[PDB]
Design a protein around this ligand. Structure first.
Ligand SMILES: C=CC(=O)Nc1cccc(Oc2nc(Nc3ccc(N4CCN(C)CC4)cc3OC)ncc2Cl)c1
Length: 317
């Protein structure tokens, strides 16, 4: 109901430079690059998403959503460039997606990092619920890694701002990832913040299995029947019953019986106090993750003079 006074910043194409392709596909191509606001003497590492009329509209809808959120655990939109191909300029998350990260660094990821990631994702989702935003595509796929100690939620291509006095979004026909969806979303295309909680549970299962595919080998058509019988994702080997019970609660058929994101923050925060009591990982105590200075950014951006580099989180309007 409140007016959305978020500012949409229009960027000139000449004040940022593409450096390398990060990903390419039907959705478009994301470039790693530097944004140099003219006259500010700063260089901001950015990800540039480059997008047909229907594709131009969906790009601007995503920009609308990202420009309306401001939280340390939700990805930051810096602005848009109105070229022949509309471009989204976002904060560079140099360590990639959390799904790829847990797969690549499986042998050096301890319980402290896993539980902290669960807290940060829950904080970001709780903020989105405070903003009356339903993500509809929460997954380890769509959590990006700024540093091993700091992750943020991204990919708002499916995200829907709940209209005034609306408790749910009713989709129609759009292709959706079934294996992360709540059962009521599968059967009835009904999406709520509590449906996001279900997807949060699958996301935690992805992390605790170090990036396993949920319901692996099963076609998506069979998924809805599997869940109706009462079958759920198995208990990950490293998970105590304490952690697994939280995931199971996210998968209750009664959406109101699932935990709230503000409660998921609390419960995982308690476990993060004593992480080895709740996740059992061999060699946990001796594991180490990089967490890199100026030398880190010279190699990342393929440029020597990184004296004026500034991360987007320290560049405020
Ligand atoms: C939805 C499909 C898809 O793959 N989208 C995608 C792909 C690449 C980047 C991307 O968006 C971002 N990516 C990043 N960081 C990042 C992501 C992936 C990578 N890698 C690099 C190695 N390999 C190619 C896999 C992808 C590296 C990154 O930083 C160096 N930071 C911010 C954004 Cl907005 C989205």
């Amino acid at each position: 109901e409140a007016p959305n006074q978020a500012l949409l910043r229009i960027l000139k194409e000449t004040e940022f430079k593409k450096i390398k392709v990060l990903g390419s596909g039907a959705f478009g191509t994301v470039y790693k690059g530097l944004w140099i606001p003219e006259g500010e003497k700063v260089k901001i590492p950015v990800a540039i998403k480059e997008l047909s009329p229907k594709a131009n509209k969906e790009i601007l809808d995503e920009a609308y959503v990202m420009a309306s959120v401001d939280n340390p655990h939700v990805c930051r939109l810096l602005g848009i460039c109105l070229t022949s191909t509309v471009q989204l300029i976002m904060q560079l998350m140099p360590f990639g997606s959390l799904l790829d990260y847990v797969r690549e660094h499986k042998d050096n990821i301890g319980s402290q990092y896993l539980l902290n990631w669960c807290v940060q994702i829950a904080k970001g989702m709780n903020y989105l619920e405070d903003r009356r935003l339903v993500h509809r595509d929460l997954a380890a796929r769509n959590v990006l890694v700024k540093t091993p100690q700091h992750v943020k939620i991204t990919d708002f291509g499916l995200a829907k701002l709940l209209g005034a006095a609306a408790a749910e979004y009713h989709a129609e026909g759009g292709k959706v990832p079934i294996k992360w969806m709540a059962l009521e979303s599968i059967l009835h295309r009904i999406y709520t913040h509590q449906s996001d909680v279900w997807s949060y549970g699958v996301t935690v299962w992805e992390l605790m299995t170090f990036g396993s595919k949920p319901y692996d080998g099963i076609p998506a058509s069979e998924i809805s029947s599997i869940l109706e019988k009462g079958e759920r994702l198995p208990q990950p080997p490293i998970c105590t019953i304490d952690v697994y019970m939280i995931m199971v609660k996210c998968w209750m058929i009664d959406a109101d019986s699932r935990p709230k994101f503000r409660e998921l923050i609390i419960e995982f925060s308690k476990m993060a106090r004593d992480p080895q009591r709740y996740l059992v990982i061999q060699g946990d105590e001796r594991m180490h993750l990089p967490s890199p200075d100026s030398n880190f950014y010279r190699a990342l951006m393929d440029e020597e003079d990184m004296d004026d580099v500034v991360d987007a989180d320290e560049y405020l309007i």
